[PDB]
Amino acid sequence: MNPPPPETSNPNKPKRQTNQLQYLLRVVLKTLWKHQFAWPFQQPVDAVKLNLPDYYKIIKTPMDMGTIKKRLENNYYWNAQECIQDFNTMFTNCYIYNKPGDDIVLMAEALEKLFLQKINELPTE
Numbered sequence: 001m002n003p004p005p006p007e008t009s010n011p012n013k014p015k016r017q018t019n020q021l022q023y024l025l026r027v028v029l030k031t032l033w034k035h036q037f038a039w040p041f042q043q044p045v046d047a048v049k050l051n052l053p054d055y056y057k058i059i060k061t062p063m064d065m066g067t068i069k070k071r072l073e074n075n076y077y078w079n080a081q082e083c084i085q086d087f088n089t090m091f092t093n094c095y096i097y098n099k100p101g102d103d104i105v106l107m108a109e110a111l112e113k114l115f116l117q118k119i120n121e122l123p124t125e
């Protein structure tokens with residue numbers, strides 16, 4: 001069964017915009033989004049549709065690029081490290097749930113390298 005998706009806005013959580021958060025949305029997220037391997041990561045894992053009944057029995061901190069995008073659009077993060085942490089959570093969840101050699105893991109690995117490539121240099125303040 002599917003849990004509620006991660007929140008994308010919270011009235012108790014303070015919002016912020018930085019030059020690095022604008023970078024992560026405009027170039028990092030939006031370039032990754034257009035990659036040929038992006039499609040499995042553009043929305044939360046639908047355990048019912050994908051016939052993965054154990055996915056949320058294993059993954060207790062789910063994360064996907066659609067949630068990250070909405071969070072960036074809503075100024076949900078305080079800084080860039082908070083957003084990068086969500087990207088790393090998405091990738092690690094995929095390696096936790098699946099095994100080396102799986103097609104999904106090969107796709108995740110390709111996207112992680114491109115992500116690291118792009119966050120290697122970020123803008124300044």
Ligand SMILES: CCc1c(-c2nc3ccc(N4CCOCC4)cc3[nH]2)[nH]c(C)c1C(C)=O
Nearest residue numbers: 039040041043045050052093094097098104
């Ligand atoms: C292999 C199952 C899996 C997916 C995934 N399988 C998908 C199949 C179809 C779609 N579609 C979405 C809407 O457009 C039409 C096609 C999205 C999918 N995402 N993602 C992740 C992170 C995993 C893991 C780690 O097990």
